[PDB]
Amino acid sequence: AQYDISFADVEKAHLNIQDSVHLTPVLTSSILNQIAGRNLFFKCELFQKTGSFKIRGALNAIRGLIPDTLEGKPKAVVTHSSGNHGQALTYAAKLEGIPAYIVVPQTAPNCKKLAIQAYGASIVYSEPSDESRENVAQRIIQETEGILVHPNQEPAVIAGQGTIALEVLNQVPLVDALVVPVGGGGMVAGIAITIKTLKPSVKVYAAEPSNADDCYQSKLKGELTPNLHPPETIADGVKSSIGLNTWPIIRDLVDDVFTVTEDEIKYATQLVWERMKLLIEPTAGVGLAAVLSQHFQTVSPEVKNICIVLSGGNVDLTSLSW
Amino acid sequence: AQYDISFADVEKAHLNIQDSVHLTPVLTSSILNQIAGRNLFFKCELFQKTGSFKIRGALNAIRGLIPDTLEGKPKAVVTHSSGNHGQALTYAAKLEGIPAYIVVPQTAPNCKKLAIQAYGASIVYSEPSDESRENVAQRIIQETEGILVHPNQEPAVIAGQGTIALEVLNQVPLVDALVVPVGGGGMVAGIAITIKTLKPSVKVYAAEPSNADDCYQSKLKGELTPNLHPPETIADGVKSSIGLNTWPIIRDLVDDVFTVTEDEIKYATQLVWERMKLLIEPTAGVGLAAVLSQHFQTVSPEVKNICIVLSGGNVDLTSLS
Ligand SMILES: *Cc1c(COP(=O)(O)O)cnc(C)c1O
Ligand SMILES: *Cc1c(COP(=O)(O)O)cnc(C)c1O
Ligand SMILES: [Mn+2]
Ligand SMILES: [Mn+2]
């Protein structure tokens, strides 16, 4: 029973990040409660700094490096990202006063790149040729003597994410289950370690697009089974597969994985928009879709109080489904 | 000096409705503060039951006007107003165990008729004659022994709306001004009465589309001056002109009216969506638009803490600008 993080790592992460992240509210909806047949509690990480929960893990993995003086601090951080991870890493870098660089091609949206240097990180353009971006990033690191930061599930990132569960437990002490969207698995793994240490009777459920169901298949097969090919889904925040760092935790401490169709993600996201007035991105609708899915009916009526993590609000408004 | 509601009406409204309405939170945005150059406080009535503040006035209208015996309670409610008022009134009627009727023009959109049925009101049809409408209304009123509940001119409705300001004063103790979207003027009138009673040093500003600028024009001219023609604006919640009951209060107790273009409303609404992740309807973006407008730069630098009323979140997600 060895995992990359412990409960202690999550408590330390809490102390490390508390002054720089929002302790986000839990909101409720009577009408959503009646549709689900459960008492629903929405943990509002869409209100978090940068528009998603990411900042938690990213700040803990950047701030928890300085030994004391200005000798073991990163000279610079370099990334490709562009999405929610990019926004998180960059903001974390600004807070710590670390020069930050983002390598992007002419494919990312205007709103996203405006919100990527919205935290003052130098934008370097590489020609849209995939492997062309690797050489430019290596050149930045050469000049700065800094570090490359790619989308990660390092211990410090998982522990930072676990802090969501610490707040949920204080905000809804009678919670019977947490429902968490799953991509690389960092969020659900951190929550799982936290929840199962403090209150082992509370359920931890993963929510996953069926078009990107590596986590579901992994649990089924009993071994790490990453996506065959880059999945196509509106839930763009959960496209990456679970990894070596999150698999053991997901295998043992996540009670079940609930898959949801593209239509179910769309309906659920629209439902939150219309009844709760919360501008969640479709990835954050996955959790509600899981709670409303046919398969979730197998879950006990005793599991009445359910916390859904609304993981982000970074919607690309220039694009629409319905 | 003497108006259709008093401060006492507002306090009674609070007692009337407090067990059944949300005390909605005040949210802040540091990036919005930097854009505006002032400290902004967003009263989140979009989180209110039915998706707008109007539940406050609608419910107070039912619970207020009562001959105080077991034999003396409204037996039904009626309105010509569909949209936010119709939805709020129906919801309040259900709370009270009472039927609600919306007088609907027979040529109204299919989708609006379905939405009215969906939230539990009986539709009664009329001609768009503005003479047969009140004819059908008064016919229902007599049939049902019910009361007509106007969206903005009814005293009990105005009083209910003012309870917003009670919460704002408790939630933002150092508030310097409230910025309130104005349509019929029920909300701004109720808020003005409340603010000018409890802390008159606090400014009350009305925010209005220039495409529907009757409140601005009325204040300028010094008399009630309705919109000449139906307003053409994305702020669908504030198309109504101010009326006989709201004008006197606005005249004396509203400090100024700030007008905003359609592009300013659209941009400020998008700003709230993108920066705050709050799905406000464009009508609710009117207040922020006012704060960001060039004319608002004339407002004294002392007026630093500004509460903007995010009045509603009932946006039709089938059409984007
Ligand atoms: C990154 C992300 C996730 C998934 O979290 P993992 O830890 O990667 O599983 C879910 N939702 C949103 C909005 C995200 O940005
Ligand atoms: C009706 C309405 C208004 C205007 O209120 P009045 O009391 O008519 O001035 C503002 N915002 C929203 C969301 C509304 O529904
Ligand atoms: Mn997956
Ligand atoms: Mn007007």
Side-chain angles (χ1 to χ4, degrees), chain A residues 46-47 276-277 279 313-314, chain B residues 46-47 276-277 279 313-314:
Chain A
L46 82 161
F47 293 142
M276 297 197 73
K277 316 305 177 182
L279 211 339
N314 291 330
Chain B
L46 85 167
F47 291 149
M276 294 193 71
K277 318 305 188 170
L279 197 34
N314 292 331

Side-chain angles (χ1 to χ4, degrees), chain B residues 40-53:
Chain B
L40 308 188
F41 294 87
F42 296 89
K43 178 63 159 159
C44 288
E45 285 300 299
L46 85 167
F47 291 149
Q48 186 60 263
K49 290 174 164 192
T50 75
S52 82
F53 70 92

